[PDB]
Structure formats: C-alpha cells, structure tokens
Design a protein around this ligand. Sequence first.
Ligand SMILES: Cc1nn(C)cc1-c1cc(C(=O)Nc2c(Cl)ccc(NS(=O)(=O)c3ccccc3F)c2F)c2ncnc(N)c2c1
Length: 404
Amino acid sequence: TSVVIVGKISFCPKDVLGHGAEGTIVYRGMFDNRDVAVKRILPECFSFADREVQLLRESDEHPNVIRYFCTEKDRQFQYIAIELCAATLQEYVEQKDFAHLGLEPITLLQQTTSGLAHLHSLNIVHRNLKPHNILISMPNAHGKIKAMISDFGLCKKLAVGRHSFSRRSGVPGTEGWIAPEMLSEDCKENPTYTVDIFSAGCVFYYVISEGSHPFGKSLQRQANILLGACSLDCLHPEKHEDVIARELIEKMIAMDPQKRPSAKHVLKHPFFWSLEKQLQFFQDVSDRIEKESLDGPIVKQLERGGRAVVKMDWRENITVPLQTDLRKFRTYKGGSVRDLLRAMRNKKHHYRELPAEVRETLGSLPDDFVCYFTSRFPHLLAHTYRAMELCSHERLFQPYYFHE
Ligand SMILES: Cc1nn(C)cc1-c1cc(C(=O)Nc2c(Cl)ccc(NS(=O)(=O)c3ccccc3F)c2F)c2ncnc(N)c2c1
C-alpha cells in the first residue's frame, strides 16, 4: 500500500479522485513538493494524450484554462500532472451552501466564459463542456477561487478561416449537454464554435438553479434538446435578475446555432454587470437619446412594447416622495420608457441637492438607487439592452456590447 514514483511525480494509488475514459484514473499526488492531480493513461490512449498535451504546450496560457505541470512515462503507462483543484463544478454545485457565497457562483461562470473565449480565439472548439470537467481551484492568499476548463479529449483545432467542422468525426460529446446540431436527423449546416455556447448555456442554468438542467431530468435531456423542449422554471419572469439571466440563457441554448451569442458577446451581457455598471448603462442611454426625435428609429424602437415595461403609467408605480419631487419643474409621459429613463438620469445627476425624504426613498448611489427602479420595473434593463443594440457600434456603448 506504498507510494508509486515515476520521475518527479509521486502518488499513492489509494488517493483516487475519480475514474473515466475506460482505464484512465485520476489520483491525487505530488510533483516538485506541490499538491497535484495525476491522470494515468493506458497505451491505447498514448496517441490522443500526446495530441492534447502538444495542443496545450503550444497554445497561449490563460488563468481559466487548466495548465499541466509535467508529463511522465514508464514502460507501461503515461502520466499527466496538473494543479490540484478543490472540486469539479459539479461537486461544487451539489455540495456548497450557496447562501454564504454571494456572487462567487456568477464569477465562476464569468471565468468559464473567459476561458472559452480564449480557446475560441485560438481556433479551438472544446465540444465537451460540462460541470464535471470545469475545475474549481484551491483558494489563493485572499481566499478567492477560479474556474478552469479541462478535458480536451474531444476538442478540435480548426484551420484558419474555417468556420466549422464535420459532425461525423469523433464522439458527439456527453449526453444531456450536446448541441442539437450534433445529433439531429435533418441538419444542413455543420457544427461550429456555438456548440460550446449551447453547452455553456446549460451550465449557466445548472449553476444558478443549483442542479437543474434546461432540458429536464437526465433520461429526458437529449431527447428534449432535439425537440427544443427547454424549461427555465427557476427564473421568475418578474424578478429583474431572473429576467436578465433568462434573456442570456435562452439565447445561448437556442435551437438555431446562428442565434447563439459568441463567448465575447456573453462576456458583455448585463448578466455580469455590477449594480453601478447597470446604472451607468441607464445614464448613457438617457444621454444618447435626449436629443433624438421621438419619430427617429432609436426612440421608436425603444418605445415598442414599452407600455408593459413601464406598467402603463410608471408614475403610479414609484413611491410618493419621488412622485412629489418629479412635479417640481417639468412633466413626464407615464407610458414612455424614454421618460422613465429621463427621470432616473435627473435624480441621479441632481442627487446631492435632492430633498432628504427623496434621497431616503431612493437609497444611496449607486447600488440602492439603481435597484429602486429595477425592482419596480424588472423588464426595464432587459428591454433597454435589446432596444439599444442599434447603437452597439458607437464608441460610447463599447463597455456594454461586443462589436467589430
Ligand atoms: C474524474 C473526476 N471525478 N471526480 C468526482 C472528480 C474528478 C477530477 C478530475 C480531475 C482531472 O481530470 N484532472 C486532469 C488531469 Cl489530472 C490531467 C489532465 C486533464 N485534462 S486533459 O485534457 O487530459 C489535459 C491534457 C494535457 C494537459 C492538460 C490537460 F487538462 C484533467 F482534467 C481533477 N483534476 C484536478 N483536481 C481535481 N480535484 C480533479 C478531479
């Protein structure tokens, strides 16, 4: 029951972290006095392992892609050592109490997307993203953690200019996480990088639902994926945060692969915006449209479907202290999204010199202020974000949209 030694890598075959890939076992081990994980490879996977190690050795590194430390070989097996991680994203979701984690789950999703964007920018599609192979690091000195993409057994490096790859070369992926175009009977378009986005969208929902899947329970998932039968039950249609998440996740898991946002679009989505940045978006919109004509395309687009956004009369859905202070020197259209944004811009720009009873009912700039409105108008941000895509090419909106 002693310790094995192959080069600089040492591990006791008792400390097993997990199995997989028929024969390959992942042990906990040691390399250069560091805690590491060691994957043992049979002779039948020597070719594949050499191709994946070569792909990471040659490719640029990134905090959210797993970095290997060392590879060893004896006359029977090949070994790969990477940094020891605290858990897979799956064990994290199953086992951690989220009540005491704050925004750490969202950060893991942002980091996973950062890693994916890096991979796609090197022309690498992953093809097998799932909670089981997204690794969660040990804490650093300040107690913070990060997600890292692992398991490149199915990944492909596309040639330059090539948008796509053939869906018949290789295992399709892991059942329940495979984009529908990898398996559907009638498919005229080859898969592309958006297969990773579909898988990422399911992971997004799995984390924020703490274990559910957009396409149902295990045995129904892959069939529901082919049908398009998705359900985001845990996202309440009238909570501002759930509306924002539903807007992103529904795009990511869309049946049409060309409707799915790129990893770089996903990184720009308000799903990741801080409260302050949300308020900065509201002010930049209000300033951008202040002198636009009501007949212009931007304002016309912003107002379509806006009556439901503002709840018919937004003046009747705020507090009385704010109502009284809006009648001081001008008038507002209660059914205009643009005028609701004007009111927010003015109260933010004159907040210091507002009455004390008004500053109390609003809360402090910016976090309590912006929540005052998004809690009352849960669709305001989602609707403004879609509507102002007409300006996504403008320098002023580069913080909010991916373009060029
Ligand atoms: C199973 C299982 N079941 N359960 C319940 C947990 C686990 C598990 C799995 C792993 C794990 O599999 N590691 C790992 C290793 Cl060691 C080696 C290579 C790759 N991938 S790779 O693409 O072959 C590749 C090839 C070359 C270069 C880089 C690279 F990634 C890799 F992903 C864990 N690794 C660390 N810490 C854990 N706690 C950890 C737990």
